[PDB]
């Protein structure tokens, strides 16, 4: 492939460099339209800018935490972090979010990796070996109420059991209700006067509940869960302007008030170098 | 003697002529078309009013003055009240449509000024409150009036800050969306053909707008000496290939 | 039972590896795809669309005005604007090009810089745009500027001029984050003759300026952008 | 070799090697030729 | 292959052993040009002197250390070794360095092995099990500021998570900007009067940041990281004189003052055996 | 699931072993090679060039 | 001995995965099947039989 | 596979929607027996409702 | 590839792709045609 | 068998078995024959 062809002096009536940008086109002008060039080859394919590659590496999408401790006398397991749920999202930690929102609709399978590490902040004789249970709870399933409810039987709901310190990995097909996922949606769920705007139910990728299967030892053990997400089989439509201001909320476009100028001011003139 | 410059668009019972065009944009290089069976889901036969809905509606005019910040209309909202297009809209459960948008602004060879005319698929607005405040329905359904970016923040309304496109992105990059400029010195109209763009084959016309049309002054209007300091901008829009499905009782929407 | 040996790296999680995994939802059938206009396949497809450069960066809060390069009637010989070419920083940084370049470590290729004139139709002007390849200072006067890559632009019916910064380089890749060894030059613009307004007209006229990449362009070695960060996880 | 039955479980896809910027860079209705005048 | 051919008495006008070294050549003289030889075969190929073999074994290129401890009240994580970076180099530990600098330009893929072991120098009830995170931070990426910054999300930057006591292994393609790497460069980054000499930006192989993912236990744990580097697919040009004096700095050729004579003095005469 | 048995040596790191590894930079394209005079392939090539001997070591 | 590398997810138990296992009862012979009317293959077969709706829910 | 065929107005002596449930059958009535439909395809096989799948986790 | 000798040890079965609701939805002795009168 | 997609991930290269010391041992412009006089 040639990156530049050889081109010499020109004295024409045919001027490729004068255009009318009002038309909305970006005319494909090249170095050889306005200087004299020599042949050179590309030596490159643009492999690593493919959208599959761009969205295809694992990104941290969520960090939560649960603890193993005596539940005796706990009136609210959920509240003691005896167990914890997470409604899956890709817009809570901003790194991956800005990447996805370069597109309007996106379609992909997900590969999740879940790393779990334990901490024992206060005096323990040892490090126990805990098994985590991660249950995938689709909308309409009973939700866990205690850390050892009938729910955890999970007879119809996919669940994975792995050890703290290890990693769990599985992949979920594209679960969207429509043909793609809208990280933007300029609509409502119905024509209600007060219903929420923008956040919709066609960007729901399910939800996940974590708990330790082990009963309690004498000390307490903090287990912190990190969920990583990798898109595989990516398809993206309609590019948009990149995010400039900071994010404030999952699912709305809102930016913070009295934010700071995002364009760097010159130290000098327009004329400055 | 054909120029890129003169054009005629006849759609239904209405025709537009421009003698100072700058080509026309067809979003994503695709022209509006009906919904193919292979893509269909709802089993209902659809209704295609054709020429009674696919004609040109001219919205009320705006006034560009030296202080203007820009205006924003949503589709199909802007047309919610135009003739039979609008009736069909409130009466069917689902509908689908593409449009021809023609924005008009003429001046003289002594004026200067340049407007950006852009179509943004799925333009989800931001609340000026920040945090996770929502933007109420009425605020994103201004109707033919559209939203005036130089109007004041209101409560439950969107933010109207132009350098941020009403969503946290910079004005400068709106050029990645199908768009055309109106530069008084060149141009006097802008025309964009919009194919139907959605993640579902057909949708509700009232709970979801699928494009915002935005006209934004970028190089300020500058009139000749002792000229009146303003020009009107007119927007005429025509639904094209419209289909309605799931007819019934007639939606009632807030406000 | 087949005998195996495990190698160093067993059990590691590399966020960039690409392997098979069990599906949690065995036998599930995804929604059919329908057609949607606009599919993107390569980021190289989109960085060829031009977007506006806030060249007039001299303001103090972001404003529509930093996209406008002003022009003065009747000045002769003088300089319209100047900038270095660190596409990952400074004026370029918020543009779509700048914004994507920042997802990669290295770039190579030609850039297309165009200027669209917005003055009254009955005015006229001749400007010179000059690209100064690495190795010399930003030009200080047109004489200096005109000895490097340049285009005399004659403002006419055809409203925009497209200047190309041809890839001039020893090393075949440069860093997107500004680096010296790897630096690309300067871009300046001067009056060639001068802007002239018709009667009954007055004041400043402005140029809009765009940037996009030529088909020439290469970007490689993906990394994280300095353009976005956060202090606590967001919630709904 | 796929070891698993479902398609979601396969590795990353392989390069589009599609690439056609014209839907984004030249969505004009009447074709523009480089070198010919923009507005006739 | 014959190592020596058979050759007998000679009384010629053709003298292969008289040459003129002023010419710059090393004339290919053999035993059989000056004594009577018998046939013998080589029995050898020179396999283990191939440059791929010479540069192809893992060498320790870096030892760093980080600790897991309560960051509460630490004003400078980087400074507490709460996390640590390393800008990749092959010229800090001298063993591999002398080997590479036998050549002027070198081109190869790298295979890294990272061994991490833990130490608990002061009273602990136990040994905790820590997971290390090694992030590859290319120039221009945000750099970690705390041990748990948004940076560590590493949504676009390759990172590996492995356990202390284990090893991590991955391989990076040749990331040089030019066609080869110059471990020598007699130049500057620009014609500045005070810019640095010799150290250049085309020998940059990236940079790497390490941290423990675990929160803190009651005791403190020292984790010491050793990075090993193996060249694979080696290509080397222009041999040079081997390094004689000791090294003083990464990237400069400088040797220490009042160094010692590097040539061993005879214990005796020139005539001595 | 195929039945396996691991042998002695599993998990060891031998600095001299030669195996495959995942690339950290999937799909990256290295700079083209250009021609450079002087390529060395074997150390046996270079030890045939003669160099001076500090024979007079007595200093 | 063939060189291997284990990936993330090793040792996990996913209630939805489908693999082979050793039989605890090697060589056992199950009872022959006889014919029984009524075999169901898909839940989609049965949701097409209509059943009564307690529409008058007001009790 | 078609999920619905195209069907238009009807004015017949052949009424598929009147039945006698006392018989114990569930007559296979479709949308196209009582409204005008357009063609649409199934795009689906009913894989995940197989009893092997239902009892197999 | 089965690694084991017994049939119980193989993975899950594969979709019936049988599907015939008529034993449940139309177990009538004399065949009913849709469109013809239910009771003659 | 390569298990990985990228070339960097393959094992060590295989012996040049190239070997030609003359660029280093005899870079003279006019060819010298062993046995013939060095300087004529």
mmCIF file of N, CA, C and O in Angstrom, chain A residues 78-106:
data_model
loop_
_atom_site.group_PDB
_atom_site.id
_atom_site.type_symbol
_atom_site.label_atom_id
_atom_site.label_comp_id
_atom_site.label_asym_id
_atom_site.label_seq_id
_atom_site.Cartn_x
_atom_site.Cartn_y
_atom_site.Cartn_z
ATOM 1 N N UNK A 78 -28.131 -7.169 54.879
ATOM 2 C CA UNK A 78 -27.717 -6.375 53.665
ATOM 3 C C UNK A 78 -26.952 -5.190 54.180
ATOM 4 O O UNK A 78 -25.886 -4.790 53.722
ATOM 5 N N UNK A 79 -27.536 -4.628 55.246
ATOM 6 C CA UNK A 79 -26.893 -3.483 55.832
ATOM 7 C C UNK A 79 -25.599 -3.752 56.532
ATOM 8 O O UNK A 79 -24.848 -2.731 56.677
ATOM 9 N N UNK A 80 -25.301 -4.938 56.988
ATOM 10 C CA UNK A 80 -24.027 -5.264 57.677
ATOM 11 C C UNK A 80 -22.966 -5.698 56.662
ATOM 12 O O UNK A 80 -21.864 -6.144 57.079
ATOM 13 N N UNK A 81 -23.287 -5.582 55.361
ATOM 14 C CA UNK A 81 -22.478 -6.115 54.305
ATOM 15 C C UNK A 81 -22.266 -7.647 54.563
ATOM 16 O O UNK A 81 -21.122 -8.111 54.345
ATOM 17 N N UNK A 82 -23.294 -8.271 55.057
ATOM 18 C CA UNK A 82 -23.195 -9.742 55.226
ATOM 19 C C UNK A 82 -23.255 -10.341 53.787
ATOM 20 O O UNK A 82 -22.674 -11.438 53.520
ATOM 21 N N UNK A 83 -23.895 -9.635 52.933
ATOM 22 C CA UNK A 83 -23.984 -9.998 51.512
ATOM 23 C C UNK A 83 -24.222 -8.690 50.780
ATOM 24 O O UNK A 83 -24.620 -7.697 51.461
ATOM 25 N N UNK A 84 -24.094 -8.641 49.461
ATOM 26 C CA UNK A 84 -24.307 -7.353 48.753
ATOM 27 C C UNK A 84 -24.735 -7.445 47.366
ATOM 28 O O UNK A 84 -24.141 -8.374 46.736
ATOM 29 N N UNK A 85 -25.585 -6.702 46.792
ATOM 30 C CA UNK A 85 -25.918 -6.859 45.310
ATOM 31 C C UNK A 85 -25.278 -5.700 44.555
ATOM 32 O O UNK A 85 -24.633 -4.892 45.225
ATOM 33 N N UNK A 86 -25.369 -5.661 43.272
ATOM 34 C CA UNK A 86 -24.809 -4.728 42.317
ATOM 35 C C UNK A 86 -25.682 -4.788 41.083
ATOM 36 O O UNK A 86 -25.851 -5.939 40.560
ATOM 37 N N UNK A 87 -26.271 -3.716 40.652
ATOM 38 C CA UNK A 87 -27.108 -3.859 39.363
ATOM 39 C C UNK A 87 -26.101 -3.450 38.296
ATOM 40 O O UNK A 87 -25.584 -2.306 38.375
ATOM 41 N N UNK A 88 -25.800 -4.388 37.396
ATOM 42 C CA UNK A 88 -24.693 -4.205 36.446
ATOM 43 C C UNK A 88 -24.827 -2.971 35.633
ATOM 44 O O UNK A 88 -25.947 -2.728 35.093
ATOM 45 N N UNK A 89 -23.873 -2.231 35.414
ATOM 46 C CA UNK A 89 -23.629 -0.990 34.810
ATOM 47 C C UNK A 89 -22.310 -0.823 34.101
ATOM 48 O O UNK A 89 -21.327 -1.575 34.615
ATOM 49 N N UNK A 90 -22.094 0.068 33.230
ATOM 50 C CA UNK A 90 -20.672 0.239 32.682
ATOM 51 C C UNK A 90 -20.404 1.745 32.790
ATOM 52 O O UNK A 90 -19.444 2.244 32.191
ATOM 53 N N UNK A 91 -21.246 2.424 33.606
ATOM 54 C CA UNK A 91 -21.109 3.891 33.614
ATOM 55 C C UNK A 91 -20.848 4.462 34.971
ATOM 56 O O UNK A 91 -20.816 5.724 35.078
ATOM 57 N N UNK A 92 -20.511 3.706 35.963
ATOM 58 C CA UNK A 92 -20.105 4.115 37.270
ATOM 59 C C UNK A 92 -18.643 4.451 37.438
ATOM 60 O O UNK A 92 -18.308 5.429 38.250
ATOM 61 N N UNK A 93 -17.716 3.683 36.929
ATOM 62 C CA UNK A 93 -16.261 4.112 36.942
ATOM 63 C C UNK A 93 -16.019 4.751 35.559
ATOM 64 O O UNK A 93 -16.232 4.071 34.510
ATOM 65 N N UNK A 94 -15.528 5.965 35.463
ATOM 66 C CA UNK A 94 -15.486 6.692 34.233
ATOM 67 C C UNK A 94 -14.543 6.235 33.194
ATOM 68 O O UNK A 94 -14.884 6.581 32.008
ATOM 69 N N UNK A 95 -13.471 5.561 33.436
ATOM 70 C CA UNK A 95 -12.521 5.200 32.320
ATOM 71 C C UNK A 95 -13.239 4.496 31.199
ATOM 72 O O UNK A 95 -13.317 5.082 30.082
ATOM 73 N N UNK A 96 -13.742 3.268 31.382
ATOM 74 C CA UNK A 96 -14.506 2.588 30.341
ATOM 75 C C UNK A 96 -15.687 3.420 29.882
ATOM 76 O O UNK A 96 -16.008 3.428 28.682
ATOM 77 N N UNK A 97 -16.378 4.134 30.721
ATOM 78 C CA UNK A 97 -17.576 4.902 30.292
ATOM 79 C C UNK A 97 -17.281 5.868 29.196
ATOM 80 O O UNK A 97 -18.035 5.958 28.168
ATOM 81 N N UNK A 98 -16.244 6.659 29.283
ATOM 82 C CA UNK A 98 -15.960 7.649 28.223
ATOM 83 C C UNK A 98 -15.739 6.917 26.914
ATOM 84 O O UNK A 98 -16.222 7.397 25.883
ATOM 85 N N UNK A 99 -15.041 5.781 26.920
ATOM 86 C CA UNK A 99 -14.764 4.950 25.749
ATOM 87 C C UNK A 99 -16.071 4.500 25.115
ATOM 88 O O UNK A 99 -16.217 4.720 23.906
ATOM 89 N N UNK A 100 -17.016 3.935 25.874
ATOM 90 C CA UNK A 100 -18.246 3.479 25.275
ATOM 91 C C UNK A 100 -19.071 4.638 24.721
ATOM 92 O O UNK A 100 -19.826 4.442 23.757
ATOM 93 N N UNK A 101 -18.978 5.788 25.365
ATOM 94 C CA UNK A 101 -19.975 6.860 24.964
ATOM 95 C C UNK A 101 -19.475 7.644 23.794
ATOM 96 O O UNK A 101 -19.949 8.747 23.542
ATOM 97 N N UNK A 102 -18.507 7.094 23.108
ATOM 98 C CA UNK A 102 -17.979 7.649 21.822
ATOM 99 C C UNK A 102 -18.957 7.217 20.702
ATOM 100 O O UNK A 102 -18.850 7.754 19.611
ATOM 101 N N UNK A 103 -19.840 6.284 20.963
ATOM 102 C CA UNK A 103 -20.850 5.651 20.179
ATOM 103 C C UNK A 103 -22.244 5.837 20.808
ATOM 104 O O UNK A 103 -22.376 6.011 22.047
ATOM 105 N N UNK A 104 -23.304 5.787 20.018
ATOM 106 C CA UNK A 104 -24.658 5.914 20.508
ATOM 107 C C UNK A 104 -25.272 4.606 20.885
ATOM 108 O O UNK A 104 -25.956 4.515 21.906
ATOM 109 N N UNK A 105 -25.166 3.567 20.077
ATOM 110 C CA UNK A 105 -25.705 2.211 20.312
ATOM 111 C C UNK A 105 -24.493 1.245 20.249
ATOM 112 O O UNK A 105 -23.653 1.460 19.345
ATOM 113 N N UNK A 106 -24.520 0.258 21.055
ATOM 114 C CA UNK A 106 -23.266 -0.650 21.108
ATOM 115 C C UNK A 106 -23.825 -1.996 21.308
ATOM 116 O O UNK A 106 -24.932 -2.082 21.964
#
